[PDB]
Amino acid sequence: TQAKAKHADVPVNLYRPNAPFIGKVISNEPLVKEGGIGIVQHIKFDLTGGNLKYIEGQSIGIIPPGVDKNGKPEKLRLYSIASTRHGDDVDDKTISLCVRQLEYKHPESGETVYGVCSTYLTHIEPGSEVKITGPVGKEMLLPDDPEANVIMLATGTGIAPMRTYLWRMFKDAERAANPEYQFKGFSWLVFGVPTTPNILYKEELEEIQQKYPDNFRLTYAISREQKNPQGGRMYIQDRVAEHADELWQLIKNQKTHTYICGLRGMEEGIDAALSAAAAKEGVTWSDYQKDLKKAGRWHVETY
Amino acid sequence: ATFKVTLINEAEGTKHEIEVPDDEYILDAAEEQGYDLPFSCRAGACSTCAGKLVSGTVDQSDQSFLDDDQIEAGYVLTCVAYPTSDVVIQTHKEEDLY
Numbered sequence: 259t260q261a262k263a264k265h266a267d268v269p270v271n272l273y274r275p276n277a278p279f280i281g282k283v284i285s286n287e288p289l290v291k292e293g294g295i296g297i298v299q300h301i302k303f304d305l306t307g308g309n310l311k312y313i314e315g316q317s318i319g320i321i322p323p324g325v326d327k328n329g330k331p332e333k334l335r336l337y338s339i340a341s342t343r344h345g346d347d348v349d350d351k352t353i354s355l356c357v358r359q360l361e362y363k364h365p366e367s368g369e370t371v372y373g374v375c376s377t378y379l380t381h382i383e384p385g386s387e388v389k390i391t392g393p394v395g396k397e398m399l400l401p402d403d404p405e406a407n408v409i410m411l412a413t414g415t416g417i418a419p420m421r422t423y424l425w426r427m428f429k430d431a432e433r434a435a436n437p438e439y440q441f442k443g444f445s446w447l448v449f450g451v452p453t454t455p456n457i458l459y460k461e462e463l464e465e466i467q468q469k470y471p472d473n474f475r476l477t478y479a480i481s482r483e484q485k486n487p488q489g490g491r492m493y494i495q496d497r498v499a500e501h502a503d504e505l506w507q508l509i510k511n512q513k514t515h516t517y518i519c520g521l522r523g524m525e526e527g528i529d530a531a532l533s534a535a536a537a538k539e540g541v542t543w544s545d546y547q548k549d550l551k552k553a554g555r556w557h558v559e560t561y
Numbered sequence: 562a563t564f565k566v567t568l569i570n571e572a573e574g575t576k577h578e579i580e581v582p583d584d585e586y587i588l589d590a591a592e593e594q595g596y597d598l599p600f601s602c603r604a605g606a607c608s609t610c611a612g613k614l615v616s617g618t619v620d621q622s623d624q625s626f627l628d629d630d631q632i633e634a635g636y637v638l639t640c641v642a643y644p645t646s647d648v649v650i651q652t653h654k655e656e657d658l659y
């Protein structure tokens with residue numbers, strides 16, 4: 259662990275629960291504005307005090323404080339790095355998180371319950387000592403080929419990993435901080451969310467739009483204020499279905515890669531779409547998809 | 562396909578043999594098959610349902626809570642593992658981590 263680093267170039271697990279790294283918080287700003295549904299907040303840790311490494315697409319563990327609520331020591335809760343490897347400040351000392359507050363009415367007594375961890379982070383205080391666990395990810399690595407096409411289907415706080423994708427790609431700073439990767443290809447993000455004001459990072463992902471017409475396309479899905487012609491609120495599955503033929507066309511390319519992230523249950527609607535549009539050209543999307551994971555071109559992380 | 566997944570337990574001494582379609586996590590299959598399995602998030606997002614493969618193979622393309630070193634031994638998450646083969650596996654393997 260801790261000193262556990264001797265192999266590969268991908269920072270994975272240079273820190274363990276058996277050797278926490280009590281990172282410290284810099285900022286903690288909302289992401290859902292008034293009118294939005296629920297609480298989702300941007301959280302930024304300082305890295306000074308350790309050798310924490312990472313890149314875009316990896317996950318970072320956070321350990322909650324507490325020894326009395328279920329008898330045993332608290333456990334890891336994993337989160338996706340919301341920032342490039344350099345951190346959110348285009349250096350190498352920071353890193354940003356995308357955390358939604360988990361609440362639900364009890365299965366039995368109906369009482370609203372608050373997940374120990376995210377309820378911790380969401381209300382977190384600047385300079386509040388936080389134990390971080392090293393990175394744990396290799397299924398959502400971002401390819402080093404500018405030419406590559408990055409398809410990104412995310413819902414809710416699944417917008418983490420595409421931010422690191424899109425930021426590095428189209429952030430002026432990083433663009434100069436990573437001269438040996440000037441994205442000239444074409445990336446495409448489909449973003450599913452309940453409300454306009456729920457559109458996380460809207461006023462930057464759209465800045466990335468007007469600046470790179472040719473390298474980035476941006477499709478919202480807003481169920482609570484968007485309807486398909488067949489008279490049904492807009493879910494990402496519905497947006498994919500609408501652009502199935504298009505999208506299918508993309509991934510049939512040679513170096514076209516796909517990235518899906520967000521809460522479990524988003525992948526079934528989308529496989530159905532590509533399936534139908536792909537079967538028209540005669541092909542089992544299950545088989546075609548079956549083989550694209552081997553070729554490392556299909557990337558799924560849903561929790 | 563639909564492979565046999567013999568659940569073995571290091572304690573009470575269980576070798577419970579179960580059948581799992583190609584499209585169902587190892588958890589739900591045996592679980593609703595008369596065998597109450599340990600689990601929590603049921604979203605590949607914790608360790609409760611951890612498993613230690615013996616002989617066999619599954620599919621781990623829906624995870625990311627997922628140490629390349631951990632998985633390198635044969636550790637599985639029953640709540641999200643598709644039998645890529647006839648799979649023998651030992652459950653209750655969540656303390657082997659951390």
Ligand SMILES: Cc1cc2nc3c(=O)[nH]c(=O)nc-3n(C[C@H](O)[C@H](O)[C@H](O)COP(=O)(O)OP(=O)(O)OC[C@H]3O[C@@H](n4cnc5c(N)ncnc54)[C@H](O)[C@@H]3O)c2cc1C
Pocket residue numbers: 317335336337338356357358359360362363364365372373374375376377415418559561601602604605606607624625626
């Ligand atoms: C790879 C990965 C990436 C992730 N990335 C992010 C991210 O960037 N942002 C993010 O917000 N989260 C993300 N998550 C999820 C996050 O790791 C935690 O699972 C989530 O935030 C739960 O927070 P908690 O620890 O506060 O909850 P906990 O305290 O663990 O409690 C949640 C528990 O509540 C119970 N439960 C939950 N809902 C119900 C219900 N309605 N009825 C009955 N029982 C229920 C279950 O026992 C469940 O595990 C990710 C998960 C993984 C695996």
Ligand code: FES
Pocket residue numbers: 599600601602603604605606607608609610611638639640641
């Ligand atoms: S029950 Fe949490 S990963 Fe399986």
